[PDB]
Structure 1
């Protein structure tokens, strides 16, 4: 798993993110780094408009394009939504929208902030010798003070990385099916359920680092896009780049490649039927880095793992296979508890279509067991 830009340690996350940009972009890095102060004080829009269009030409390597995609993405969010209480800007100054779309088209990602930006690429190690633990990590950017962007993004990333552990087992699954190595296929499928089970226990920290009021009345604002959004019914103007406004979807863990790849590996068909849930998870593949996108389409090239287990009358496999599927139902069920706390309950102090979506995606996962 190498032309797919999958890291063995952190999987789909970008390993070792650049923290700083070339000096040529210090007028970008200064806004990005002070979005909370700059919003609260009423200047961010100003300070953005008073900017010189910069060239991306001095963004050499990928990690530099990736930091800049993040820097510009966070700034865009800050510009459009501003203070997060309804004063929306619907035109993105050419001095920012042009070099953003330039980089976005270069990296075949939409010009909006995505999961691969504010999670897969929005982190640093405090001490490079300590492991990947919460106490040794931080985020590079945030929107407001108290938006719990650090907790949300790092727990998200830490759960990714947990599930990542399973990705290195996918080759052995497919090889054990080809070579008809029954003992091995079984072990590999239990190893994968075990990784998905640790991913859940990690998710448990969310409560210690996120605040419901903050997630719902603040962070969720800055993460919202402009697709089917009343406040931007027609999209955003990317001044100096598109002639018409363009709708793009806010960030969402449906943009995450790990969970899609296990729904695919296990033959769970979140992307079938043309239902609302399937279409959405399919669309979000277009917000994933291109290599992570071909990773998914390449698994689908493979012999179904599900059909292979069905077809063997081998209780021990049907268990190993169900151990995997169950872990996704565990996670999806624990996710709904958190959605109840961090959205539904604050919302009452809209939120029904979310639950239909999450509950359909679960229902499709549970209805894939063999029990």
Structure 2
């Protein structure tokens, strides 16, 4: 079965739509000139003075996902505004109704998710040149000097690097079924190599994303309205819903690729009934329908951990541990990123636990997730 996985990019949208049809030019002009409109402070006036447009004219899947990115970026720009404190609790019917109808059609929440701002928000400058940062550029930004290009593309490049292991997954379960030791050993080491390579692509974040520019500018526009003191009851969608509704902000916890390795290796991140387990499970509803199907498809298969444990095979245990060590390394490095990009900039701000964009007590959350990964290390059985 097909889960919209590409051979070249993985779970990213393969060469996404760059521009909407002529009927939706009113939405496109607002989203493209978004840094200018916020800085002037005239964004909120133009969204209110807009016409309610029907979503029927959107032809294909690539167009529909771009429209989610267009309307999603505008919604975040309308709510947070300049990003200082003054917020809009109400989203006008002219934008709220078409966005909710598109969200329901694509089985996604009416909020900017990872699939919009990362997986669909990219273009390559030269089509003949291979996929690299210097050849790539984002489609939409929130502000000037907010490091949108560096942040969204590095996240995408790590996604693509790790997605090289997705093609190895069919080999893993076939080797278990056919009872093929040498094949499974080579397959697991290949996955471990991909995750080690993804860590090297991660290093690029320091070059292209500024710590102060991320925290005080860009981070506010990725934040949502679930477990948020600024929008306590949430957001009222005028015309569509009767009561204010809570929805979580964007995170890479909404990525299928990164959740899939925990599932493949039998790292029970979603089990336990804890706050960390609850978040990662809830974020699957913030993923595309096809990507959600892939995750439980992996859960439906025999456990790789249980297979390797029963064998009494030092080489097969080592190859399995190589994957787990690679995931620990990525999560240890991610926490170092958190120190540089959240923790240190937060202490520099002028006049109790810190919360992420997704809506978690981040330091306790991320360490629990890493601890669960560390516990999965076999260490000679």
Give the TM-score taking structure 2 as reference length: 0.96
Length, aligned pairs only = 369
Structure 1 residues 302, 203: closer, same or farther in 2, change over 3 A? same
Structure 1 residues 225, 351: closer, same or farther in 2, change over 3 A? closer
1:268-313 Cα distance to aligned partner (Å, 9 max, x none): 0110111110000000000000010010011000000000000101
Question: What aligned pairs does 1:8-23 form with structure 2 within 5 A after superposition?
Answer: 8-23=7-22
Structure 1 residues 17, 352: closer, same or farther in 2, change over 3 A? closer
CA shift, 1:352, in A, is 9.5
* Correspondence for 2:291: 292
Could you tell me whether the CA contact under 8 Å between 1:66 and 1:117 is conserved in 2?
Answer: yes
* Correspondence for 2:352: none
Structure 1 residues 352, 16: closer, same or farther in 2, change over 3 A? closer
Q: Distance in 2 between matches of 1:306 and 1:136?
A: 39
Structure 1 residues 26, 46: closer, same or farther in 2, change over 3 A? same
Could you tell me whether the CA contact under 8 Å between 1:344 and 1:351 is conserved in 2?
Answer: no
* Residue 207 in structure 1 maps to residue 215 in structure 2: no
Aligned CA-pair RMSD: 1.2
Q: Distance in 2 between matches of 1:311 and 1:112?
A: 45
CA shift, 1:353, in A, is 2.4
Structure 1 residues 200, 232: closer, same or farther in 2, change over 3 A? same
1:102-127 Cα distance to aligned partner (Å, 9 max, x none): 10000000000000000000000110
Q: Secondary structure at the match of 2:285?
A: helix
Q: Is there any run of 5+ residues in structure 2 with no aligned partner, and where?
A: 348-357
CA shift, 1:344, in A, is 0.2
Could you tell me whether the CA contact under 8 Å between 2:249 and 2:359 is conserved in 1?
Answer: no
CA shift, 1:235, in A, is 1.1
Q: Secondary structure at the match of 2:56?
A: coil
CA shift, 1:351, in A, is 11
Could you tell me whether the CA contact under 8 Å between 1:116 and 1:288 is conserved in 2?
Answer: yes
Q: Distance in 1 between matches of 2:95 and 2:367?
A: 39
CA shift, 1:218, in A, is 1.1
Structure 1 residues 301, 248: closer, same or farther in 2, change over 3 A? same
Q: Secondary structure at the match of 2:311?
A: coil
* Residue 158 in structure 1 maps to residue 157 in structure 2: yes
1:145-164 Cα distance to aligned partner (Å, 9 max, x none): 11111111000000000000
Could you tell me whether the CA contact under 8 Å between 2:227 and 2:359 is conserved in 1?
Answer: no
Could you tell me whether the CA contact under 8 Å between 2:226 and 2:359 is conserved in 1?
Answer: no
Q: After the TM superposition, which segments of 4 or more aligned residues of structure 1 sit over 2 Å from their partners? A: 350-353
Q: Distance in 2 between matches of 1:183 and 1:125?
A: 39
Q: Is there any run of 5+ residues in structure 1 with no aligned partner, and where?
A: none
Give the TM-score taking structure 1 as reference length: 0.98
Q: Distance in 2 between matches of 1:218 and 1:354?
A: 19
CA shift, 1:340, in A, is 0.3
Could you tell me whether the CA contact under 8 Å between 1:343 and 1:351 is conserved in 2?
Answer: no
Could you tell me whether the CA contact under 8 Å between 2:122 and 2:139 is conserved in 1?
Answer: yes
1:15-65 Cα distance to aligned partner (Å, 9 max, x none): 111000001001100000011100000110011111101111110100000
Could you tell me whether the CA contact under 8 Å between 1:109 and 1:289 is conserved in 2?
Answer: yes
Q: Secondary structure at the match of 2:110?
A: coil
Q: Distance in 1 between matches of 2:360 and 2:251?
A: 17
Q: Secondary structure at the match of 1:311?
A: helix
Q: Distance in 2 between matches of 1:315 and 1:82?
A: 57
My pick for the range that moved more, 185-194 or 350-359, is 350-359
